[PDB]
A paper describes a structure:
The replisome that replicates the eukaryotic genome consists of at least three engines: the [name]-MCM-GINS ([name]) helicase that separates duplex DNA at the replication fork and two DNA polymerases, one on each strand, that replicate the unwound DNA. Here, we determined a series of cryo-electron microscopy structures of a yeast replisome comprising [name], leading-strand polymerase Polε and three accessory factors on a forked DNA. In these structures, Polε engages or disengages with the motor domains of the [name] by occupying two alternative positions, which closely correlate with the rotational movement of the single-stranded DNA around the MCM pore. During this process, the polymerase remains stably coupled to the helicase using [name] as a hinge.
To test this hypothesis, we performed a rigorous 3D classification focused on the C tier of the MCM ring of all replisome particles. This analysis identified six conformational states of the replisome, referred to as States I-VI, which vary in both Polε stability (Conformers I-IV) and the location of leading-strand DNA lining the MCM pore. In State IV (1.2% of the total particles, 7.29 Å), the leading strand DNA is completely released from [name] and translocated onto [name] to engage with [name]/3/7/4 subunits. Coincidentally, Polε is further destabilized in this state. Therefore, in Conformer IV, [name]-NTD becomes the only part connecting Polε to [name]. Notably, minor conformational changes in the Polε binding sites can also be observed from Conformer II (State III) to Conformer III (State IV), gradually leading to a floppy Polε.
Author numbering:
A (entry chain C): 1 to 58, 68 to 144, 158 to 194
B (entry chain 2): 773 to 800, 804 to 868
C (entry chain A): 1 to 107, 119 to 208
D (entry chain 5): 20 to 107, 131 to 198, 205 to 213, 235 to 305, 320 to 338, 348 to 415, 421 to 443, 446 to 451, ...
E (entry chain B): 1 to 38, 47 to 201
F (entry chain 3): 18 to 56, 90 to 331, 338 to 449, 454 to 497, 503 to 583, 648
G (entry chain 2): 580 to 583, 588 to 609, 614 to 629, 640 to 676
H (entry chain D): 75 to 107, 120 to 294
Amino acid sequence: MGYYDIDDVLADGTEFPCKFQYDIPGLGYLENNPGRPITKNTKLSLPLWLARILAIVGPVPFVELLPPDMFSTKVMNAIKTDPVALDLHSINSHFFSLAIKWIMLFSEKELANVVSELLLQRAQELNHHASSLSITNIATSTFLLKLEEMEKEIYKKSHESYKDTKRWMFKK
Amino acid sequence: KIYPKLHQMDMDKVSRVYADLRRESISTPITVRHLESILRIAESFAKMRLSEFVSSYDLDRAIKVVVDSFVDAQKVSVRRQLRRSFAIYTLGH
Amino acid sequence: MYGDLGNKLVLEAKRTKQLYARSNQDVNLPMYHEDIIRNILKEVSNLRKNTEYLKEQQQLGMLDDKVAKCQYFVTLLCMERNKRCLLAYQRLRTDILDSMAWNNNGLDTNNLSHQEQEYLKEYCDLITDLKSGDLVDIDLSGSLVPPSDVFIDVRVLKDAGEIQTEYGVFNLIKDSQFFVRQSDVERLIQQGYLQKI
Amino acid sequence: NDDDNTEIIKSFKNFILEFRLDSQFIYRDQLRNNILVKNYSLTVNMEHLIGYNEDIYKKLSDEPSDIIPLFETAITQVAKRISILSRASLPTFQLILNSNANQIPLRDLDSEHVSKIVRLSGIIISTSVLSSRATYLSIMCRNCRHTTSITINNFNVSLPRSCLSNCGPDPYIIIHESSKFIDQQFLKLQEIPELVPVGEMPRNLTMTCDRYLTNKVIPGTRVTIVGIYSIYNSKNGVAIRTPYIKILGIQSDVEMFTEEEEEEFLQLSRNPKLYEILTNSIAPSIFGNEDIKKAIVCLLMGGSKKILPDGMRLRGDINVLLLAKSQLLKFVEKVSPIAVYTSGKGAAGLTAEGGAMVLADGGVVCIDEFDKMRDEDRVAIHEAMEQQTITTVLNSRTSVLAAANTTILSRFDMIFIVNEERDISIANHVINIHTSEISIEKMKRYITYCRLKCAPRLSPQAAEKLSSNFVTIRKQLLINPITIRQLEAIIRITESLAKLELSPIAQERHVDEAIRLFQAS
Amino acid sequence: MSLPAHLQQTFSPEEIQFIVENEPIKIFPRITTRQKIRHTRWQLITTDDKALNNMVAMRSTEVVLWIALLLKQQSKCSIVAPQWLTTKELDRKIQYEKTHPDRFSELPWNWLVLARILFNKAKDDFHDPIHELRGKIQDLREIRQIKVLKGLKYLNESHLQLDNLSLLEINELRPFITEIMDKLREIHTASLT
Amino acid sequence: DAVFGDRVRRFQEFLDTFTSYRDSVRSIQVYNSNNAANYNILPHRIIISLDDLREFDRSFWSGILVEPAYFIPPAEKALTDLADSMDDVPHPNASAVSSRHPWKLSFKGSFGAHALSPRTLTAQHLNKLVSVEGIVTKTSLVRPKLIRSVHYAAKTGRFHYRDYTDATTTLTTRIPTPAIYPTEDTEGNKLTTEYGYSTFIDHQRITVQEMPEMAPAGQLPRSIDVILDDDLVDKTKPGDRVNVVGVFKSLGAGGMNQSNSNTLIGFKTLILGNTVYPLHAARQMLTDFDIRNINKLSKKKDIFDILSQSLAPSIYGHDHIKKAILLMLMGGVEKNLENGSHLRGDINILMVGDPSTAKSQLLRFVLNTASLAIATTGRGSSGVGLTAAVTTDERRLEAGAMVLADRGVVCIDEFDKMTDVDRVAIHEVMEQQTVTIHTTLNARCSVIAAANPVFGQYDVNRDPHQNIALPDSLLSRFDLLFVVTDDINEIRDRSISEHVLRTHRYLPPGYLEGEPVRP
Amino acid sequence: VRKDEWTLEGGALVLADKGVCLIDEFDQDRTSIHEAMEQQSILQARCSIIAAANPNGGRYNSTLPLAQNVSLTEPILSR
Amino acid sequence: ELLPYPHQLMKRLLNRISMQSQLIENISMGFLDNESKLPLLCMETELERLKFVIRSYIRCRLSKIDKFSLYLRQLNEDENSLISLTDLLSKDEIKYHDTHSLIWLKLVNDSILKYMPEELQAINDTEGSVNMIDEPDWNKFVFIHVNGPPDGKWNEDPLLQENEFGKPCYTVTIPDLKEEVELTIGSIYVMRYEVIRDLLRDDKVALI
DNA sequence: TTTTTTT
């Protein structure tokens, strides 16, 4: 999550729904209307880097973020059913980082517990896949397609470590 | 038992003749497929002579056969002009 | 938006980082994203002009306390995001260049920018200078692999011809094997002339 | 016997535990990996086991059908030992094997070949749907209400008549819930045409597969099967039997970029002369016809597809019409990621069943002789190629190419018609046969990659240029008809041209190129 | 950068082998490097030279494992097999692991690497057949792997204890376990007010 | 048995944990009593969240998934006991007491691996609860079952009853019941079957083809039959997507029996659906806040203008046609007189314009704007087909395109290209609002028509009817006739070019510039 | 094609292989010939083509070019 | 975190390496003029291994210096920092850090800071939401093996204390959870580097 | 078997 971290930059660039708590003339560029003043109660998705700051500051905060479908209770129920079967990458490549940022902006113990359980199950599956080494598979391909980009990087690191260890063991 | 082999010098003359035949078809068609058919008919004439190497006369008679095919196509329309233009081209020898 | 170009540049940086992590051997780095960088710089110049206009509006005094403050804050945040993206991409490319200099220059100029090429030359000069002086006894450019094998059979991957040794000249005639200490043949292996006996 | 069978299972387990490919036991490691992937099965190479342990292979060849279940039981025992901690059963593990021996022709297979392992090759005519085989059962005796379990191996048993706690004639009745089942697929494999004697149709044989062996292949695929020739009697000559081959293993003859792989596409996009290079590589033997090559490239790229919020959708494919074009169409069929080359015969229609136009999706679809063919008349083709749709409707979202020698021309995005040194060079190449440059596959992959990666839109300058040119053309025509359909065709051509460079937006240069190409219409 | 990306988190198996080589090992010399009262010298700056210079034929002596293997490359050196590297000791460790699924057998942290290196080179010195020792090592590795799987099932963000686990096993598990525990700790911290 | 009793107690504990489930069972009972008094009776079927059963006991939910036969029957028995206790059951009929309707149980949401498709269905899923989704196909016609063959021995005064069980109907395997009415009573008096007292529940078993998009290329989609009973029967029809929470069940000998010599056949597998859910993939939903907003919109000075401007906002120059389309979407009022005369509740509009005038684009936008719409193209549209359709099947009648969505509007491209005979068949729809073949199909649908001039370019000198291919009688049959055609003006051309450029410049929220999509 | 079960029978052009095949009345047979000439496949004909076609189904007339006398392809005439 | 540079130990090792190389060269001259080169090969391999270890440690130190160049400039500017930059680094390390930071600052300034407004032109400023200065993660988890007390006597170490089953242990606390735990002597554990740093400075535990 | 009608 570094300042120069490209993945963190992309996750911050991701937009989230929000509802305006203020009416600001001259902010029509965010509205995408050249001369229309911003209005209170207006609903507009905003980039996470800007939406989070607007939710933090404003006293009444300047904007209030609406709950995303990635944070929807239906997605939560699907995760509680089967953490592995869900396509977290299709939902968001930075879904875990976005969940962590949403927990930081709004402390949610149950959400953190559900996210941790999903991460643990997906990590067990990813560890099984990484332990499976060549002496592309459809099952691993579908699992990676479900797996987010960060989880795929972790899986690549673990699988490369296992493959290097096996190669060094089987070769002089 | 015999596999005809195209002669290189006769084939050079036949390639010049094939360019001339395409030009004559434009004048009054002829195709690289027809030139390949000339090579095959030269193989056929070598077979008729039972020669493993295609004769220059075999290639010439094959060019004559392909020219006869071109003349037969649109016979009344182009046959006289084709014969006049191909009196030298139909047979290399 | 203005930050979208920086996001695209950072996406290219992440793609190149994943590629370099995938390939152990150093590939020729992707050509510098001069187009996206120049677009981001033009956006930064436009935002600077907008901030100057906002300061002029504040001198006019209309809503300078709140509306102009928010507009200037938004423009400054956009400039900061663009600068962060550009710095991240440049740092990743420069780290790749430093790794390449450690790999080869210690023992694809079109892809690099001219400033990047000057920086890589300066890094190679710095490496040679660090080896040239104190701690010169150990070749800092020497391989980081532990000395597992004192002696190893060596033969030419290529017919380079005569080659120097500590006290010998060895012909590298094609497919000519040898039996020598690994340390002396480490430089020749780095040259690639001899591979695995 | 039963002690000998237990000894055979124990010997299989011992060989698995004590066989090491290179001082590392592949059998133990492969079984553990299959357990990790939850693969309740194991694949064993006959070469590794029988390279020096010939006695096991001899016993297996003696009684393969009965021996295999003992090997599977040994696999289950070894898996339980390796994976389940003691003092802290598993589903049956299928055994997969490969003969790795000389194949036998399907016609050469005879009655003596039955009851023995056979290696062969052929093309599967079809693959039957899965059929669950009851691996286990619980059979309740009706008259005394008590149950007795039954397990079945799908090799080479029926419900016992007696009740055995005998109160009934056939009182035993299965408990479907307690019964455990395994899917099984039947396969019909035709012999390879070379294996068929000259002047004879290939012979076909019924074959069976179960568990992981099911769905391992697809119908129509040439494949090499490892299986024991067997016999069975269908319920439907005298003493005649129905031959079949229980499969031990299958090896198919038929059989997303890396860090280095994607960089090649990046370089191809980096080339500024990429469009002209593609046009030149298309029909290299043909001299001239630059407009034809450019139109082919633009059709392969296709216009950008978009859907308006109101539900209106822009056509996502360019259409080209021609009036040696057959060679160009043959090249286009290979270069296109998806293409169907035909003279309109299909007797299947071009638009229809599924036509060639419907089967082709995106890419380009080429017709060798569109005007010559009259089946699947142009009335259906007009709707298909204009609205990308056809009381039957079929998707027709694929670039249209027509070779030959109105309303269809109005639907078409473009129209067209159809050197001695070129003839000499082509003749020299053909004679050598008889006695920029980019690979076709690489160019097809690059075209698909550009279509998947970028769908360029018109920049404001390109839109203004297109509007001004369209107004000028309309004024000239009024002074002298061009339609907004042709204007949309030109816009699609501009988007297709920008797609090669993968630019975020099209350019006035693309607009000029599209207008120049349209001038040939 | 100076440090490879894979090396940023964990030591390579070759590095673990180098550490194991830095460990010492007993061997039987075949050269009377010791000179009678009636010559080149090691003069090692990182290790004892007196043992090497005092080695005599068939006089058991201990030296750093790398130097021991270097001498074993010559016929002069024959490495002494570790006592725990015996069939009876391996069977005892296996029985201990079986009786204690929770508790790993007290094998050395470099037991796996040392057994592999000895099988590569010191297979001749083993009085017990090398194949039986290899099978026992594989069985112990499988038991330890099952125990590691159970422990991963019983992971906790606060801490973990692995007493008798092999150093190679710890190095292999460092990336995955460290990343998972760090992610869990980050989730718990974000949950914390 | 004892485990079944423990599961019944645990499911009663689940109903106690979620008061809403017990309240819903009692609500079905109370609604049944009130509706029986008023006359419309709710079936004794209960659907609960799978996550709710998991919250009550994760072990119970996973156990129902693993052994639906062992758990779901006891859980439904517990639900039925709770419903019997909660229900007043006033004045129960003897036939109702004989019926003794069980309270069905269903699991909703969070299926995971239990969520399935017919191609992905497995033998392990057999004897296990699952949720399968796919396009319905080959649905069986509803056939009444028999809960019990209630009988009555003659002169005995006692009604002997014989229950019958089906393996597909019951998740647990059972020895087959005779399913034959007893000829004589156990007492020895002659036994007569008691119709009415005997209970018959409708049973339907519908195959469910895997979704064609989900079907692999070069392969036919798999189909798994799902058992349906009571309200679940006839819940969906072939060609309609549906998702059913049903336990896959191994069944039959599968070649294990002695009669099957080949033994090649596998064990029959038939899913037993606890519930059937039709799925759109539509129909708009109205809430109180949106209704207040709609009241404010009606309070607006130009409500019709606001709605029309909202309709096809991207389309340019067709705003008057969009106002006419809003009038057609309302359709007007439909009236059936005491005399039987019919006033149509639909309005037909026709607009003629040259190709690429976007009149057909506005018609497509109207088809999208309508919750239900019929699409046709005059070159490809037959009026006989629009009025009615014939299927070979005895032949089965099929509704015509105009008859389809008989209340909804029908948008037709190239209506002028459609033949005049087709237009006469359409006139049967336009004026009579009904079609007669000897089968008769109602055709009161609105007919919005996109057309082109017969010349292909509208001429001011030519009359609008002369330019239109439709006859004057057809134009009179149409409620409105328009002439919206492509034209070239300088300022309007700049505006339309800016509109197309604005459509291109519109950026999907998820896709940035240079990224493909998907007052 | 015929039932055997189902079995297939080889075509006549396929039956004539490597030996010169024969054609007459040069239009479905012409399509088999012409698809063969462009395709190199009739299934490959694998045989030379010899034509004995009456011109336009009647006595030959000198005025008609061969393409009119027998319907065919110009590429077929070239081949 | 970068460890403090041991100048005396590094210098003594370097002097020993120099003397060993000189002696090996003298032996080589004598051989070129008993005669057993096996001890010479042993000394050469020992020198190679020692030089490799020293170079690896120095390269890791330079990597840490470049990773926290901003934080090291901040620490050098910060008199309140307990450790002087020269104390933490070697002389060559300090010169390298200074020159590298200056070169990077010149490059970044000429690249972007000329166009950037002066208020935001500062490279190491904390005004950004993510501080541009990069510092070592104290709380990062790192494996460790309890070395036990540096002294032979377990009782002599106050940190060492009897735990259950007669096992010496060292009490430790994780500030985030405020959890206290005892680490048995001669045992391996995984803990945050911040809490581990106390025992590491005490040398009671060595990082794995 | 005999319309019916779609190919």
